[PDB]
Symmetry: D3
Subunit: 234 residues, 6 copies
Amino acid sequence: SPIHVRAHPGDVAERVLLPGDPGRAEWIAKTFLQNPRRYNDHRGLWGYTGLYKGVPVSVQTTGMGTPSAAIVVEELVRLGARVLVRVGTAGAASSDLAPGELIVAQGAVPLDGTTRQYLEGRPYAPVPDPEVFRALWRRAEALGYPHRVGLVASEDAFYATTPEEARAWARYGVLAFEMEASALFLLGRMRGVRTGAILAVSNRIGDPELAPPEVLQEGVRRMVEVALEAVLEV
Amino acid sequence: SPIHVRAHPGDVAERVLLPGDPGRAEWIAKTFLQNPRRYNDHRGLWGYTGLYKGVPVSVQTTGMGTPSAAIVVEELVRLGARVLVRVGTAGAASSDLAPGELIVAQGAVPLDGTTRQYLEGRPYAPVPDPEVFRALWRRAEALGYPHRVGLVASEDAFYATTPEEARAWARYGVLAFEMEASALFLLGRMRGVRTGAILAVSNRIGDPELAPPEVLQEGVRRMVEVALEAVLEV
Amino acid sequence: SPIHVRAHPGDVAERVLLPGDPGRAEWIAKTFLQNPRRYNDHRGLWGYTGLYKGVPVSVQTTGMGTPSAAIVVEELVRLGARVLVRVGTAGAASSDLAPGELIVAQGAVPLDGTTRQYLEGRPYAPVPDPEVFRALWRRAEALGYPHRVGLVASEDAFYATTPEEARAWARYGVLAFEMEASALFLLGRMRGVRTGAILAVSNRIGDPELAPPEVLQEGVRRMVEVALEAVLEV
Amino acid sequence: SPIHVRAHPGDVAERVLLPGDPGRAEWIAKTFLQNPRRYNDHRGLWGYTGLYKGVPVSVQTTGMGTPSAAIVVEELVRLGARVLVRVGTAGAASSDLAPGELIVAQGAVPLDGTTRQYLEGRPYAPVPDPEVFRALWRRAEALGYPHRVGLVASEDAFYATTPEEARAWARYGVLAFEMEASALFLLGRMRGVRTGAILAVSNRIGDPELAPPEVLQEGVRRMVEVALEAVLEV
Amino acid sequence: SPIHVRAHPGDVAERVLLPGDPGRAEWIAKTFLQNPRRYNDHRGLWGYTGLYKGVPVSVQTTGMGTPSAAIVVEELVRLGARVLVRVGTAGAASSDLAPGELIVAQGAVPLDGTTRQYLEGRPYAPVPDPEVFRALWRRAEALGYPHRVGLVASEDAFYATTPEEARAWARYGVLAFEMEASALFLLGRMRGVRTGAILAVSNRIGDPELAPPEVLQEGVRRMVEVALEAVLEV
Amino acid sequence: SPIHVRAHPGDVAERVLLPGDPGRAEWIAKTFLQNPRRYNDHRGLWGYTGLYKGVPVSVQTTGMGTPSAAIVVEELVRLGARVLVRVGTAGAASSDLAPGELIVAQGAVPLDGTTRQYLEGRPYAPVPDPEVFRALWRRAEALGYPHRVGLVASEDAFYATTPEEARAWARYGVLAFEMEASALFLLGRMRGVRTGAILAVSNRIGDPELAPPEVLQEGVRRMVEVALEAVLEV
Ligand SMILES: Nc1ncnc2c1ncn2[C@@H]1O[C@H](CO)[C@@H](O)[C@H]1O
Ligand SMILES: Nc1ncnc2c1ncn2[C@@H]1O[C@H](CO)[C@@H](O)[C@H]1O
Ligand SMILES: Nc1ncnc2c1ncn2[C@@H]1O[C@H](CO)[C@@H](O)[C@H]1O
Ligand SMILES: Nc1ncnc2c1ncn2[C@@H]1O[C@H](CO)[C@@H](O)[C@H]1O
Ligand SMILES: Nc1ncnc2c1ncn2[C@@H]1O[C@H](CO)[C@@H](O)[C@H]1O
Ligand SMILES: Nc1ncnc2c1ncn2[C@@H]1O[C@H](CO)[C@@H](O)[C@H]1O
């Protein structure tokens, strides 16, 4: 059994969703999955498995940061995960993005040391699996939810980025900041598995608090629904 | 008039194709465009403009390497370019990519110094414009032309990369090596224009020569058609 | 109330133990603290406050990785944390360090990207607060529990480091690898709070699994006992 | 037969001048060479061969940037080039260097990615061949043409450098900016050939346009004379 | 016999004091030791050996800069040196340190190139041997001499660091700047010997001159006394 | 009066030779200078001033390593030094350089941290003053001494470079390793003074000991002579 996600042979399904927060994971399992069984709770890394419209689907908590997320991904791939789609939140880098908006990550700027350690310092363009990416973009369009497509930046120091630095990054195409995408995408190519990421803007860089819970929840629901319909596509 | 691409308002169309080789530019102009006209030949940067299915389309040579293409792109943008798609060739990094095969660039690892200078050393994930990327992908499918969608690595030193170094990059998802995409993608986001890149494999890194004209030529023809159909879509 | 550790000023004591796993947090609260109360469970970041020999002591879960821990330390300081001692586990860099042995961290090689982001790429020597470091070393001696005093290395990629790379680092004095210390030490200096770190070796780098519960539990119990005794000393 | 400069050993003389602009290459062949013959035009990399004062000399275009130049240089060496002297233009970094003034590159600061890739990140001091350097310096003195002997900077991003960044570099000895010297000098030492570079200042960093056609043209004329007189002396 | 410190077997004692200035090495030997004997003077790297309270103690000059210190340390170790304590001067970074104050180095920020070359660019936390660190601290207290325990920064360019930068580093815990600590600490771990460092602030960064030889002198005597007591403890 | 080289303006001549070894500075003074007087002995940095064929000439010790050398050079410039020429030894990186052979430094690969700190990490090509370099070159030929003209590499860790790395560097043009020239050349440009460097190969990289006293002493004498004759022409 893996060191952190202590699950067994058949616990994890080929299709997995990766929320960073264990609380969102739980909500997804109860709200969208039939016959949900929690196969792991060690280290608060709640992971569940059930059926979504007849297809087996897993929901695994990654924790915050790429160091934490990388661990979960590597182990999920060992357990059998084939398609892993992250469903998280992000802080808008600019002002054209408003809380509640969705982001289909086309790529993730690697500002984290996890991808850096796996790459031994080499440059790199973390991008999701083209198919998964395409699937997320279609489903989002299909459902008709206000969404954006483009770059996000995966960082490590949540509290080190200043609004001014956020603006500087936006001039480079970064729509928002998060802390897991880059490593996921990198591992996707390294371990030969299909990955993707869709985010829900929960705040603007610099905000002392997140957007009103109502606004937030609605974006999360839409995001999860897109991700779920998308994972079935591939 | 710009310092390198000495063209005047009206010469360059909104839609532009960016081949690295000026000989191909000439060929594309005569072969696909009605009433082709060469608006620039300074420094060998042969740039044409004609109509493709009634729509204005320009074909501007970039030269080899990001330093060169950067110059061409920055200036084309000043002149009015809004949608720029590079149609070049690349060297297979892996063994599954067969010469002649097409690659729709989903992202470009930045191993060049041009992106490094524009970014001041900051990490980055060069990606094409989502819409353009999407259009290129779809058009390839609609035309029934086999294709690969993925990452390419933009490098500066053509003769530096060893097959062993290539296989290493292939393990990170790099399909092939070329020398212009990264800066195109970066400038795309920096200047607010939509870019893209479709490449025709012309060899497999390590090869003393390129591939047989005929096998590679049909690839080049398809690439251009896809690229032309795509720029009219967006 | 902070964004991640949803608590208030009066919920956190001046002295805080920082385990990485919420499971140990809960275990410490119930096993060592009198009248322990959980002030947070958001994101699984389990936090407890109670009394130890009459002195208020908080036990906050940090999660895995400096990005997670940094978010948690920044917020604990905001909430009035003054003395923070990490009580975690680590992987031995050499064959001579056996599971269960204790390590009083004299410093932490910064291999993570979190410290890097805060330091804007500048070199640095992550070190504990001198008085806390000395307090941990003294209690360990006063209690008659064997221990090692030295350097540990804070990394981002759990599954990148191979046994050969770890032993190479051992030549430079690295006793073990873990994933939180460096940032804790850095933030200690940046935010002006006393911090320290004590670890219990739970495995040798490269081991498929961790050591058997009993062997490790006594080391963990000892570690926790030393930490609580040391925080009351400062 | 090289992949880019499609010539064969024998088409290229041991003495070669390396202009960036292909039109300048043509001008030099028809102007100073007897029985000029173009041996390559592939990729617009115009190359000529003829006699200068009874000695065989080649004028090969390199294109803009160290990526393009490194390719041409690597192939010219294959074709058997022994002495290669760059004859280009440059943008003044200081305010004392006026358009039309000549520079005998004593060294070239490597700000490009080409040399970086070749050196694998290692620091380096790009310098010409001692003798070529001396011959150029001597010939410029003899012909009594006002010149400067010092450092130039080789960059990748033409439109990135600002007047302020240039003045800053001037304080370190950088006399002017260009885009090929560094790679030429590096490759010279690596492939066992003699290289050198003489430049004619055509503008000041930040200038929207080059200097008057007339003023610039004379400088180019002296530069070539100096270069031709020099390569014949080694 | 070593290349620089031309001593013979047995000349060097197991415990060694390392002043950067030969003038100070001479003074220490003739002031605190019994039967001071000079075993080396080649390259001005004055080294003495005598008895401190019946124990053999050496005082080896290091010179300035980590490159010089590194040579001396390497050769001393190769000669049998076991305990090496640096006794030098430093430049205060903040106003929180006055001239004449003693600093017991807890660690040393590696801003130098020597540590960098030995580490091949890898991050690192240079610290003293724990016991030597502990001893230095313990003796300072037992002798009633005021002192500070914290970080110092080891740099290369003495005349480059500005007061503004120094204050910046202060925000990260840097108490003062010196030029040998980092390499000594690193070599201590690599070479398996016990090192440590105590410094006497002799000025503020930016000061045109060093503090009056009076206020400074008492600080230096205290520093040397503590270091002597210390090396005997280990 | 400077902090390290405690001399008065009149003490230092416009022309200065900069040997690293204080013992050689003395030998130079007593062997080539008429009426030589020592103006400094503080920190072992022995400095002398006398007459060479009627012209005032100073001989100032630099110590080992760019850190120490930069200090000395900075202070000499502030004292009035106009022409500074290093006269030292170096370690051959290849087999075609025998001990006792002379090298006129055309440039110096900056492997040191001092130049790095002064440059704030920017790339660069340490080169001497054109005229000084020319004079050094011309004199060596005039006195008919066997010499090489090319690159050296200034390093920080004397004991880190392996015969293998030395050879790798040799393929890039490096003839020998030393520890001062790079910072000298950089400062020469920054402070507006004419610098130069000439070395006498005294060993091969990896040698336990230096060559026989006589083979090397003749090289040193020729080197010192060429430097003297040279500074008199600048
Ligand atoms: N402003 C922000 N900066 C970084 N990560 C953010 C932000 N807002 C939300 N997140 C996401 O949620 C967590 C931080 O609250 C991270 O896991 C990250 O992916
Ligand atoms: N193996 C290869 N490596 C780098 N660039 C290549 C390769 N094959 C084709 N190219 C493309 O064509 C040029 C090099 O011939 C570059 O402009 C690049 O875009
Ligand atoms: N071998 C190891 N490598 C890295 N971190 C380790 C190791 N063993 C235990 N840890 C610690 O526990 C977690 C990984 O299980 C990390 O949070 C880290 O601090
Ligand atoms: N200001 C400048 N910046 C960079 N390259 C310049 C400049 N002026 C002239 N050049 C030279 O000419 C080309 C850019 O026009 C490059 O190949 C370069 O060598
Ligand atoms: N301001 C300062 N900056 C750097 N080193 C200093 C300073 N003051 C004293 N020193 C120490 O003494 C020498 C410089 O005089 C160096 O060896 C260093 O360790
Ligand atoms: N092999 C070598 N490596 C580095 N520096 C050397 C070598 N041989 C002689 N030196 C020179 O002499 C000193 C080291 O003894 C340095 O100041 C340096 O300039």
